[PDB]
Ligand binder design. Structure first.
Ligand code: HEM
Length: 291
């Protein structure tokens, strides 16, 4: 099963920078969402969830086809809450109807990371919408109530190794769990809408207690008022993950570089880029543009 990237007709870097900017300006404008966390974190989660359906074995799922727009995937229990990110992006799609759905969802995540002061994430265009019957079944996204061996095995399906897994998980410094969406409640950190390596520092430095939340699920809670999922905490229970947690806790630049690589890879899994495709784009932030 082959998905060849096809550049939206006649478009180039400037066109996609305009879409970036519109997303970034709306992120700035719609500041109140989720008790003033804003839409950055949910856009990052949306980009991951539309990518994380991928299966390396048969190239089903993945970001290419933009299939989140169809009811089966939209209504996946694993995707509860992401409707907010979709609704956010709706007016952007209306303004730029030429961009594919998978390009828009993935670019939303890139824009959020960068506007939250994260690393630059190179991004490639050319995902093409595919029909409703290409939508992957529910159940391809990961469970939170599991251990390190689960996490490691899960991510093999997305062709991610230990370092890539631990780097990607650093996104859990962003935003929060919401009891109504996932059966977990609380923020992972103090800087909910700024991208840093706080996830790793908090895992190592906080005093975590294994408690039950109001949905009768176990989660790790700190006296500082933070939480970790069982799968997050597994990164300090497994010796191989722990070494990499310590590395990123002690080197902000290394985390940023490794995250950027793993996140681009996640967003591009399943896609074949022609040898004469454009190079990946690196978008300027609003701040860099004086906007
Ligand atoms: C073992 C893997 C993972 C599990 C089990 C998992 C699970 C969860 C759960 C249960 C939530 C809360 C959803 C809600 O209640 O609103 C969540 C939030 C989120 N996840 Fe993950 N996740 C995993 C990996 C990732 C990865 C790879 C990324 C992206 C690089 C990511 C990004 C986020 C973001 C940013 C949030 C916050 C969303 C918000 O504030 O609205 N997750 N995740």
């Amino acid at each position: 099963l082959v998905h060849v990237a096809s550049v939206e007709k006649g478009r180039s870097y400037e066109d996609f920078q305009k879409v970036y900017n519109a997303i970034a300006l709306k992120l700035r404008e719609d500041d109140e969402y989720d008790n003033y966390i804003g839409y950055g974190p949910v856009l990052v989660r949306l980009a991951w969830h539309i990518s994380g359906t991928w299966d390396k074995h048969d190239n089903t799922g993945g970001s290419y086809g933009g299939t989140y727009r169809f009811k089966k995937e939209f209504n996946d229990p694993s995707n509860a809450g992401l409707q907010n990110g979709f609704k956010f992006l709706e007016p952007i799609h209306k303004e730029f109807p030429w961009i594919s759905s998978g390009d828009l969802f993935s670019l939303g995540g890139v824009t959020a990371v960068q506007e939250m002061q994260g690393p630059k994430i190179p991004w490639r265009c050319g995902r093409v919408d595919t029909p409703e019957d290409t939508t992957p079944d529910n159940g391809r996204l990961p469970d939170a109530d599991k251990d390190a061996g689960y996490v490691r095995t899960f991510f093999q399906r997305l062709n991610m190794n230990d370092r890539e897994v631990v780097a990607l998980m650093g996104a859990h410094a962003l935003g929060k769990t919401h009891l109504k969406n996932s059966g977990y409640e609380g923020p992972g950190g103090a800087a909910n809408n700024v991208f840093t390596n706080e996830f790793y520092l908090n895992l190592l430095n906080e005093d975590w207690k294994l408690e039950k939340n109001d949905a009768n699920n176990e989660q790790w809670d700190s006296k500082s008022g933070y939480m970790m999922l069982p799968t997050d905490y597994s990164l300090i229970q497994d010796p191989k993950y722990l070494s990499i947690v310590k590395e990123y806790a002690n080197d902000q630049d290394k985390f940023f570089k490794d995250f950027s690589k793993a996140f681009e890879k996640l967003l591009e899994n399943g896609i074949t880029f022609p040898k004469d495709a454009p190079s990946p784009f690196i978008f300027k932030t609003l701040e860099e543009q004086g906007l």
